[PDB]
Structure formats: structure tokens, C-alpha cells
Amino acid sequence: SMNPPPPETSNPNKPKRQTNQLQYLLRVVLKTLWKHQFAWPFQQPVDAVKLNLPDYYKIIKTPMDMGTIKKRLENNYYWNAQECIQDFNTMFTNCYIYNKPGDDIVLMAEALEKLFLQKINELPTEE
Template sequence: FQITSHEWSAPFLQPVDVVGLQLDDYHKIITKPMDFSTIQNKMEGKDGTKYKSVREIYSDVRLIFTNAMTYNDEHHDVHIMAKLLLEKFEEKWLQLLPKVENEERKQQVEPNDVPTTDTSPEDAIAKLAKDTDDELNEINKQLEMLRNMVVQRCRYVLKTFISCLLLFATDL
């Protein structure tokens, strides 16, 4: 996940340390804890669990952030970070949704149809997850390039503006 590289992702990478942080009420408020290491383990089929669809992964990523926003007050740093990361994730999900839906349609097999490949559903999901991750990485690169272009243009406009102000000031 590219979102796990974000500077604010640290609180969401591992399970919440309920004991270390002395969060005695955490499990009373959060009934289904989730974090990125748990998602990664589930994607790899560790602990005997495995995702059946990309939408399940999507749901668990959302759960990470909604849990953080539910437990923490809206002014708490973790709540604010979760809200921002959820917004970024949702934006990327909307961009990928047509591809996900297309892949889901491809995977639907009529009862009388014979599959034409030896690919298991788990392998197909893993491939789709990897393709989705690759696409997210590419989108992030493009966004970073656009951000850099905007910054450069703003700097140019600002320099031009300052130069004009200086010329105007010397004419006075």
C-alpha cells in the first residue's frame, strides 16, 4: 500500500498497543480492531485467513481509519491523521473502482462455463491487489509530479510579482 508510506501512517501500521498506551476502554469502543500489518498478513494468507475480494481489502482499510476516528476525539492528532488518510484513500479508490468492477465482471463465471485458466480465485485476487497497488503507486507519482509543477509555477509567478513590485518601488 502506498498509503502506508505516508508520513502520518505510523499509528496505523501495527495493532493498537492497548496495554502500553493504557487504553482500558479501547475494546469496549472498537469491536473489530484493524491495522495495515493485519491486512498484509491476510493478503498473504497468514493465520489461515485470506481475502476473497479487493472490496474486502477496501473495507478493512476504511475500518482502520474509522476505528481511529471513532475512538479518538475529532481534535486529537490521530483522528485528524486518520481523517486525512481516509480522504486520500477514498480519492484513490474512486479512481480504481472502474478497474475493480471490470475485474469482478471478468471473474464472474456462469455455472455452465468452464474456466479457461488454471488460476485460482486467490491468485486472481492477489494479482488484482498487486495491479491495484501498482496503479496506486503510479497515480502517486503523477500527483507528486503535478504538485511539483504547481509549486514551480507558483514560485515563478511569485518571483515575477516581486520583481514587478521592486521595479514599481524604484520608480517612486
Template sequence: MPSQSSTPVAPPGFPKKPMHYLPAADLPRALERCRRLLDKLLQHEDGWVFAKPVDTHSLDLRDYLSVIAEPMDLGTVSRRLELRRYPNLLSFAKDVRRTFSNAMTYNNKGDDVYESAAKLSRIFESGWASILAALPSPPPVAERRARLKDELPQLPVDLQGKAVVIMKDIGGWIQEVDGRVEVDFDKADEATLDKLEWLLALAAMKLEAGALDNQI
């Protein structure tokens, strides 16, 4: 029987909206710190419980998917990290927290799975706070827009195309002039800036991966 307990919250003093802005070149290194924290969770003696999706069939949990709307597990988080699917640090933390909150929602307090989730959740929040504490403060929005205006045209063509799609979604696409697409960065809010900066980070990670390949 699912418990009626609320989902776990961040400990006192933890920022309600964690800062997840990073210069594009710094994001890969920050995600590597996330990788180390995730490995710590998986290597914990209780980590195996959350390493794979819940097998509702073999465990005969017929009501699981009706109680848990968005299943998540640390193995899926690990694969998403490997595939560079996280555009920022906050999206990584959201998936890890969902893994443990799902377990604490479906299981009763005092059950082994509930207590394991609570224990690993505390370990995660402690490590996550350390990661956040090391992040730089974000520059003003105007500075971010100006940097994107300078750096986006230098992206590979495929990533420039993705940038155009993002800008079209907010009505920031103007027109194509002499083969170049012009966009209105003044229309980009912070959420859109996050997406565009992720493209810069993705390009940086591809460049770094290529450099490593050349050294092998």
C-alpha cells in the same frame, strides 16, 4: 474520551455498494492494485500510526476494547493480502475503512490520531474509486452460474471439496453419482457465486505462483 462523531462515509458520488465482481483470472491483478494503494498509505508520513494493532496495554487504553468492537490495522490488512485471505475487493476495502473509522470513533476530532485517520481515509477513498472505475461490469447471474458449472470440476480436489461445503450451506448439494458430487447451481445466489468464484481465483493465483517458482 471517545468522540461521538459518526464513522466516516464515502465521498459524494461514491457507489453505496461498490462493484467487486471480477473474472477469476483478473482478481490477482486487481488485488495487486489494492496492494499498491495499501503501500501508499503505509508509506505516508502518518502511516506508521496505523501499521500495527493498537497497543492498549502500553498506551493504557483500558476502555479501548469496550469502545472498538472490531480492531483493525493496516499491518493486518497487509498480511491478509499476502496470505490471499480476501475473497473479493470489497472485503479488503472494509478492513481498511475499519482501521480509520476505529481511530475516528475512539479519538476526538482535532486529535492528532483522528486527523491522521481522516487524512489517510481521504487518500484511500480517492485511490479506491480509481480501482472501482477500472472494474468490468459483471455478467448476468445465469452466465456466472454456467461458467462455474463448467470450470469448478477442473479445480484441484481440495478446492472442489471447499466448493461442495459452500453449496451444502445453501442446500445446493444433491448427491454423489459415480464418484462425482452433483450440485444445483440454480440455488446459488450472488453471495454464493462470489465465494465459488473466489475458489477459481485462488486456483489461478496458485497456478501463477507455481509458474513463477519454475522460472526462478
């Protein structure tokens, strides 16, 4: 089976704004997660072909990854911080859905999610 095209990261027809919360999501949240020792499987779309997972895109219909999230942030693709937060949650929950409790990849996602939740708890108030 083929991989799907990666999620869209740019759309010239979308309105754009910068907010202190979206700036925080890029400068603090994404940066903190990216450098984590368990980040690397989440830094690009799942390549189901390379990984020989023919059923991955049969099961996961809303793929997401931190490479995509970062590009969306850099491109001012998001209008609301909540959109970006949803994309992180989609990434984590896709991992839990496809895989099984206790799997190494799940433990990796769990560590990132812990850190994510800590940083989102420190999200500054909308200015």
C-alpha cells in the same frame, strides 16, 4: 486489561484467488498509504496495554490496522476486493469512534483516508 489476539490473517480452509483488484489493493493502495508520514500509528494493532488505554477494547469490538490488512493481502486471505476495502473503512471508523474530532490521531487518519479514497476511485475494473 489484556490485549485481544490480533485479527486472523491466514486460514488454510479459505479458498484463494488472485484478481487484478486485489493486486491493485496491495501494490498501489496499501503501498501508497504505508509510506505516508502519518501511517505509523496504523501499521500495527493498537497495543492498548503499551498505550495505557484500558477502555480501547471495551469500545472497539472490531479492531483493524494496516499491518493486518497487508498480511491478509500477502496471504490471499481476501476473496473480494470489497472485503479489503471494508477493513480499511473499519480501521478509519474505529479511529473516529474511539477518539474525538480534531484529535491529532484523527487528523492523521483523515489524511490517510483522503488518500485511500483517491486510490479507490482509481480502482481498475474487474478483469
